[PDB]
């Protein structure tokens, strides 16, 4: 038949409307999403009258809700899940869980009882909770995207995403639970059925996701030098996870997707060094396309069906709703602030204001409102939901995303550190004399003595981006000097092929956490790296439980082996962190004295470094003697890494010098890459000779 | 409504299966596509037996053909076109075109003739051409990978890619043309209709593709620091191009996609490197997915529907068919071997055998066969087509791919040159020396002391993968030594940022062309590099023609009466010309409206609106003319180019006077515009023709830019040659043993160097504009490169955090991109400075 894929013209054409908006409106503070919404609203009026609504451009007007809930939401969730930094997230998971779960529950309940008590169109309990779960899903991408470069503590930058991802994940679960109670009546059930439902939606999801993630990460480490297989495996795995977990067996697919994304992101080492860049870009492109599509459908739908039945009463109600939701978020944050402060980091009074004002609603709420509107057929439900959600989203995008910069400048954390200013000044001045030296060298050239030097001034250089008691002074400068004077050492050794990978981050975070702290020498060894060396946890208690419990009987030895491996991993990591700390402080011990002018603090620093050394020096041997295999295993695994690194730079030196061609060097580099990848998957412990 | 979007899971499973093959049968010489076909054949029967699997495979068993034809084919063709090497393909464009066109036409004709009678099938001639066009589509990817493994000639790979790409592109169009008239006849209308069909399927599509490619390249050239935007505009451009080409406006279709892909691939400079790398990976992934899916449906369909009723003789026919498709194609090459030898690179009988045995069918033919079978309704069409196509594809993949491995070693191109083997042996020996030196360093560590040293054997190094009258020898070995010295010098000049890339690739391919020649050095630039210095294209001649077209008096006589010069300034200001051009552009729409009305209460308005608009435009033109001409007098009549704007006004006045009454007098009721009013309207379309005065300089500057770019490339090539010659003269001076070898080589080098330096000096003297710009560009680009190196050194030294380093980095790349699109011409400085 002459039938054609009518959906191609719209979904692609909409993309173009994004491309103009992103490039043209990037300078203005206002995001392009509101422009996309206005474009969709304008297109809706034209579509209403003219016969331009063919089977295309009109199918989206009555777009099927199940497939959009089944396609858009999983990719929207998984992109943010993949973009996460899992390592820093584990350090505050405990705080984030209590900031997310209870916060979402309380916020949804309060903003539901508000609409139950305020609005005239009477709604029961279920509809109110569906409304609240729709209006309690945030999207603070811009806040972090603009706060990361400001130099603020990365803890806030990761905590914002940690709370937002969990909020979005649980909002869909609550919405789905409370949707079938009103839209799809299925008689009644006893308490046992409810218990089974709760267990299957809360426990089965993450477990299924974890199992699939483990299977795919085990199957991914066995494939060598083939990017296509990795990409195809990941793409098939995520879709299979969601589809099987949601359709064939009734489990929460989105939670399984979240767990799979987090687990895969944690194991990025097994991924090829170049595949993950392509994967990140591809997922980000999908998320951008989905956001553009969702905004345009909202824009076209709202102007025709969602506006016929409104009155000034509702337009007044909208302001009260906005005030209520921002107030509720503020009260939740303030009430939970003492508990957060008591447990670990917490937050100051400054960060709470930004947390409250930094919550921008996103496409998730709009998609849920569209689904609600599509399912319903009357005006009491499906007209208030979409109109209210669109109004709240537009208000937030207009106000908060515009005033966040002024709020930051007022709070004073937008200030640039003076050490950063002087570092930038020195760097630009030295790049200047380097450019001058290069120009001087090019000046005495037989051929290049004729080029006009006006274009040399035109190239110029990147200027400075910023432009614009007797004892308490030298000790602070000494402290901020030693912290990075020791920080540099980890990178210097690692670039030589040292400290594996995890040790670098593990010790740089320990070095920087005490930097913001006042009047305490960093790297105190008080359970900082002692925790990894000890390896104290009930893992061995679980192994003891297995032992007292003990082919089915032969399964227990397999559990014993996996427990042994998981112990040896932590033992090896402790060995690496101890070795790295010792190696770094050995250099800084001779480094410090050259800049330190005052002797009475220089000797204090030397003594405290000696104290930091000898304890960990003894502890390393204490860990070595009990389990001799781990030390020889880690030393052996490090030697091959160093040797392969040296092979790598001699190959690159020959290639750069021109003595080798391109294809032979590429083949040898591929071979050494394969050898190092084979090195990465190695037995945890090697018995001593 | 989407209670179960079951269309997903199967396709995902398909990819899994393919992945498994690529991980399990990698060592096997047979490609994984045979394994995929076996898997599909196995799965088909179990799908038929089990109702649930039949439900899951119902869509595949009933894939509608229209979407398959217009989804997989565009992405496949665009992926094949994108990974192309545009330059080497352009160096043999004529050869590739003639070979592809003639070979495809001849093969299709002979195959149709063969299937006419020998097969004893009840087919007519049109479906015979259908079958011939289906079978003659190839995709030699695996064989090309095999050739590139052992380092076959890059030119051979370029030819075997170009021929295949053009073959598929033309075969798809021929198949569509001879399918539409067969399955859905539209009878006959007019020979002119046939001519219009030929024109719309031949020329329109390439022009549409070129237009969209130019537009998207221009739009992309201005986007800075946005990867997602570039990726999405590229994807949308390709999809919209194919969509508008195939349906709505009716053109060739895939030809437009081919042109767009080639143009985009050639202008990859304006695309940021990460963007093009990501696009390459994405397109090849899509192609792999499409191939996997196509083989999946081929297996399923040949399992359930096809093969049901096949007699014993059909397989016999299959064998015969194979021989045909392995003979005629080869003879075609021979029948064009004497001619193609005279064209470009020529060829050799060994290469003739290679491309004769290197013709492998693939996904395109199977997809077309599947479309035919889906649109079929009986057994003589579709079932036989599927069976024969699958047989030929499987036979080719099994036989040709396996046999060419023996063929290459039995002819002798798989040999490894002993200089390469000795160089690799020395390289791995020195690498092993580095390994043992590192082990010696690290075996005495205060910490890494108890590590077991047996793992050194684990480190090891790759053993050589190859494993296994006196004048002429020193001449040839010395010549090869000079050649390698040259190319390593050029690579050094590049990595230090001194030679760009186009000059490098051109001159190194000249180098290896001289290398394969018999005792021939790079030789003096008689035309090998002198051509790059002489812009002997007709472009400059056309520039002279444009200049004489634009020839006019620099300053018209200055009026003095009444306002005088100010009035002349009114009649010669750029604002007045811009206003006249804008008036012409705005009245062009009235011409379109009048034409639409003539070709056709709605008409009541147009009965007078067109006349009113025409009168207003005529009055505006008369006022503009009154603004000019005054004071010039005879100078107004002297300027014939300017006077050409008065004939349109005279014609408009005559038409207005005639149409005022048309009954009172003048034309009256004679044979005139009274009979047909189009004569009044058609003349009104001439006013838009008085606009080339400002358009000519645009193409003048375009040609100037083209010739300046050619001059810049020539200067870069000369710089590279002279620098490499100096370095080699300073390096080899003591390497050469025989005094006479040194004398001959140094004399040849001296002749070349002191010829090329004088040629470059003459070029600089005659046209100082381009050389200065080239020097400035090279200086600033090397300055930026060294600044980037210093920034990277600072990052390595940890003086700055990595995020500030990245900020300075992308600022440097922004400056570099601003450098790339800078004009290639710089005015000379005044002598005072
Ligand atoms: C970390 C995860 C996020 C944190 C927690 C997230 C969500 C909360 C968790 C679990 C669900 C509890 C929330 C609703 C409380 C009532 C649960 C309930 O009652 O369920 C039942 C489920 O019965 C079923 O049909 C089970 C069959 C449905 C499965 C698919 C087929 C709702 O039907 P019903 O019989 O009660 O109807 C109400 C009857 N009247 C009005 C007379 C009381
Ligand atoms: C770079 C290019 C590479 C390849 C080079 C060549 C490309 C094109 C090549 C070969 C085909 C051209 C000559 C084909 C002659 C028949 C085509 C023909 O005549 O079309 C006409 C044109 O009417 C049309 O429907 C086109 C107008 C309507 C457009 C929408 C349909 C089809 O009417 P018909 O008389 O054929 O119907 C067959 C009647 N019987 C069976 C009695 C003869």
Numbering used by the authors:
A (entry chain A): 71 to 538, 573 to 654, 813 to 951
B (entry chain B): 71 to 538, 573 to 704, 723 to 955
Q: What did the original publication write about this model?
A:
SLC9C1 is therefore an essential component of the pH–sAC–cAMP signalling pathway in metazoa, required for sperm motility and fertilization.
To understand the molecular basis of cAMP regulation, we determined the cryo-EM structure of SLC9C1 in the presence of cAMP, which was built into the EM maps reconstructed to 3.6 Å. Consistent with SLC9C1 being inactive at 0 mV, we observed no structural differences in the NHE transporter module. The CNBDs could not be modelled, with either absent or poor map features for the CNBDs at lower contour levels, and this decreased the size of the modelled cytoplasmic interface. Consistent with this interpretation, S4 and the connecting ICH3, ICH4 and ICH5 helices have moved outwards from their previously modelled position. The movement of the ICH3–ICH6 helices in the presence of cAMP is propagated to the VSD domains and increases their mobility. As such, cryo-EM map density for only one of the VSD domains was observed and at a lower local resolution of about 3.5 to 6.5 Å resolution. The detachment of ICH7 from the transporter module is clearly correlated with the repositioning of S4 and the VSD. Thus, it appears that cAMP has primed SLC9C1 for activation by detaching CNBD interactions with the cytoplasmic end of S4.
